[PDB]
Amino acid sequence: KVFGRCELAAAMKRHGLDNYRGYSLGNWVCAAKFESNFNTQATNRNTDGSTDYGILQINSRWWCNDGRTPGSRNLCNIPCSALLSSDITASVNCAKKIVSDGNGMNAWVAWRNRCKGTDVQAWIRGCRL
């Protein structure tokens, strides 16, 4: 599923991401835009052989099991395919674990390089939230 900007903002808010660990909702929407272009089915292969999955491009090296990343962990205790669903619940729950682990949203390269330090509230401007 390809979300609209405000549709995704409202879904993320219902799932508890607004100000989760101090990150306002615009941060999450900006990260989703640049990681996946709001597409829950996005996948991208990394040079080390791991793969990133879903709307927040969660990586199989640490966070989910895809059966083809030898020596990886599965800290969200989910198959990576669960992260491609039109229902973002699995992605959100896993992201909450990721952002809690110490590095905050710096875990998302696109967030660091394209959202951090910008006016992220613009990403939820106009939405009925």
Annotated binding-site members for substrate: 101
- In the window 57-86, what residues touch Cl ion (CB under 5 A)? 69, 72
- In the window 23-62, what residues touch Na ion (CB under 5 A)? 60
| Binding-site residues | 101
Let me know if 7 is a catalytic residue. no
Q: For the chain, how many residues are written? A: 129
Q: What are phi and psi of 91, to 5 degrees?
A: -60, -45
Among candidate residues 18, 48, 52, 87, the one labeled active-site is 52
Tokens at residue 79, please? 């198959």
Residue with the CB atom nearest Cl ion in the bound state: 26
Cα-Cα-Cα-Cα torsion 5, 99, 56, 128, nearest 10 degrees, comes to -10
Tokens at residue 106, please? 């710096």
- In the window 61-90, what residues touch Na ion (CB under 5 A)? 65, 69, 72, 74
Let me know if 52 is a catalytic residue. yes
Which residue, among 109, 105, 111, 98, has the nearest Cα to 31 in the 3D structure?
A: 111
Smallest distance from the beta carbon of 65 to Na ion, in angstroms?
5
Residues in contact with Na ion by CB under 5 A are 60, 65, 69, 72, 74
| Active-site residue set | 35, 52
